[PDB]
Enzyme design. Sequence first.
Site, PDB file in Angstrom:
ATOM      1  N   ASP A  28      -5.914   1.472   8.020  1.00 43.38           N
ATOM      2  CA  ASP A  28      -7.152   1.141   7.303  1.00 43.38           C
ATOM      3  C   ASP A  28      -7.556  -0.329   7.514  1.00 43.38           C
ATOM      4  OD1 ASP A  28      -5.246  -0.079   5.684  1.00 43.38           O
ATOM      5  OD2 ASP A  28      -5.644   1.172   3.941  1.00 43.38           O
TER       6      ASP A  28
ATOM      7  N   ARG B 295     -11.119  -4.230   6.451  1.00 42.78           N
ATOM      8  CA  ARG B 295     -10.458  -3.278   5.574  1.00 42.78           C
ATOM      9  C   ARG B 295     -11.466  -2.183   5.232  1.00 42.78           C
ATOM     10  NH1 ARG B 295      -8.579   0.213   2.592  1.00 42.78           N
ATOM     11  NH2 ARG B 295      -6.759   0.000   1.230  1.00 42.78           N
TER      12      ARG B 295
ATOM     13  N   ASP C 103      -7.219   4.574   1.343  1.00 45.53           N
ATOM     14  CA  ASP C 103      -5.923   3.976   1.392  1.00 45.53           C
ATOM     15  C   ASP C 103      -5.054   4.821   2.321  1.00 45.53           C
ATOM     16  OD1 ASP C 103      -4.085   1.838   0.595  1.00 45.53           O
ATOM     17  OD2 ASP C 103      -3.063   3.435  -0.554  1.00 45.53           O
ATOM     18  N   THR C 104      -4.653   4.222   3.431  1.00 44.26           N
ATOM     19  CA  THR C 104      -3.704   4.853   4.316  1.00 44.26           C
ATOM     20  C   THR C 104      -2.321   4.376   3.915  1.00 44.26           C
ATOM     21  OG1 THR C 104      -4.071   3.069   5.903  1.00 44.26           O
ATOM     22  CG2 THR C 104      -5.228   5.175   6.291  1.00 44.26           C
TER      23      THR C 104
ATOM     24  N   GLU D 289       1.166   2.540   4.435  1.00 44.76           N
ATOM     25  CA  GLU D 289       1.638   1.435   5.278  1.00 44.76           C
ATOM     26  C   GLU D 289       2.470   2.060   6.398  1.00 44.76           C
ATOM     27  OE1 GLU D 289       0.593  -1.809   4.577  1.00 44.76           O
ATOM     28  OE2 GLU D 289      -0.556  -0.739   3.028  1.00 44.76           O
TER      29      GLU D 289
ATOM     30  N   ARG E  67     -10.692 -10.392   4.111  1.00 42.70           N
ATOM     31  CA  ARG E  67     -10.937  -9.258   4.991  1.00 42.70           C
ATOM     32  C   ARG E  67     -12.342  -8.724   4.732  1.00 42.70           C
ATOM     33  NH1 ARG E  67      -5.925  -5.428   3.397  1.00 42.70           N
ATOM     34  NH2 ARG E  67      -7.237  -5.683   1.534  1.00 42.70           N
TER      35      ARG E  67
HETATM   36  C1  THP Z   1     -10.287  -1.381  -0.217  1.00 37.75           C
HETATM   37  C2  THP Z   1     -10.328  -2.633  -1.032  1.00 37.75           C
HETATM   38  C3  THP Z   1      -9.162  -3.366  -1.250  1.00 37.75           C
HETATM   39  N1  THP Z   1      -9.201  -4.512  -1.976  1.00 37.75           N
HETATM   40  C4  THP Z   1      -8.012  -5.315  -2.269  1.00 37.75           C
HETATM   41  C5  THP Z   1      -7.482  -4.819  -3.597  1.00 37.75           C
HETATM   42  C6  THP Z   1      -5.973  -4.795  -3.428  1.00 37.75           C
HETATM   43  O1  THP Z   1      -5.419  -5.945  -4.114  1.00 37.75           O
HETATM   44  P1  THP Z   1      -3.858  -6.167  -4.429  1.00 37.75           P
HETATM   45  O2  THP Z   1      -3.167  -6.708  -3.199  1.00 37.75           O
HETATM   46  O3  THP Z   1      -4.148  -7.221  -5.456  1.00 37.75           O
HETATM   47  O4  THP Z   1      -3.291  -4.848  -4.891  1.00 37.75           O
HETATM   48  C7  THP Z   1      -5.743  -4.829  -1.909  1.00 37.75           C
HETATM   49  C8  THP Z   1      -5.301  -3.485  -1.360  1.00 37.75           C
HETATM   50  O5  THP Z   1      -5.424  -3.502   0.039  1.00 37.75           O
HETATM   51  P2  THP Z   1      -4.301  -2.830   0.975  1.00 37.75           P
HETATM   52  O6  THP Z   1      -4.241  -1.338   0.661  1.00 37.75           O
HETATM   53  O7  THP Z   1      -4.819  -3.131   2.362  1.00 37.75           O
HETATM   54  O8  THP Z   1      -3.114  -3.601   0.519  1.00 37.75           O
HETATM   55  O9  THP Z   1      -6.963  -5.167  -1.296  1.00 37.75           O
HETATM   56  C9  THP Z   1     -10.428  -4.945  -2.517  1.00 37.75           C
HETATM   57  O10 THP Z   1     -10.425  -5.998  -3.186  1.00 37.75           O
HETATM   58  N2  THP Z   1     -11.578  -4.273  -2.327  1.00 37.75           N
HETATM   59  C10 THP Z   1     -11.598  -3.136  -1.612  1.00 37.75           C
HETATM   60  O11 THP Z   1     -12.679  -2.525  -1.442  1.00 37.75           O
HETATM   61 CA    CA Z   2      -2.795   0.599   2.924  1.00 36.06          CA
END
Ligand code: THP
Ligand code: CA
Length: 129
Positions: free
Chosen positions: A15, A29, A34-35, A37, A75
């Site tokens: 993702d 991103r 959510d894929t 890891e 991102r």
């Molecule tokens: C998809 C997405 C993720 N995120 C942030 C929230 C998550 O924060 P936390 O790290 O605080 O949990 C993190 C999850 O991404 P990943 O699944 O790439 O880790 O990226 C956003 O802020 N907005 C979004 O639209």
């Molecule tokens: Ca992920």
Amino acid sequence: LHKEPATLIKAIDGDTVKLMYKGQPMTFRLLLVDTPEFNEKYGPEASAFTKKMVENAKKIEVEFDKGQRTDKYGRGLAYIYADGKMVNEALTRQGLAKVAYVYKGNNTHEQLLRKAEAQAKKEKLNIWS
Ligand SMILES: Cc1cn([C@H]2C[C@H](OP(=O)(O)O)[C@@H](COP(=O)(O)O)O2)c(=O)[nH]c1=O
Ligand SMILES: [Ca+2]
């Protein structure tokens, strides 16, 4: 919502993808998914799915929603399209991703992705097996 051009710089995982957008390198991103890891179950399959999809695309496009365009980690947040097919939706349909991180403001394609997820679940695909 409108599509803008961008070129693959590098596949990263399920993702996330490195793209050149408005002539700048930038990690994107995928909105609303959510894929796993890479180290989790179906992670490598997710990574390979996205990898192949962006890598074989002649045209990569980027589509922002009405809300936030950057996350707290800098991102890019977008729907990504590979020759007109949305990666976000394609992962979900194949059950290589779950609908997730649904925030009001950045949710234009939620129903569409929930539709895809529902069909993946129905077929007990990948994650749902
Ligand atoms: C998809 C997405 C993720 N995120 C942030 C929230 C998550 O924060 P936390 O790290 O605080 O949990 C993190 C999850 O991404 P990943 O699944 O790439 O880790 O990226 C956003 O802020 N907005 C979004 O639209
Ligand atoms: Ca992920």
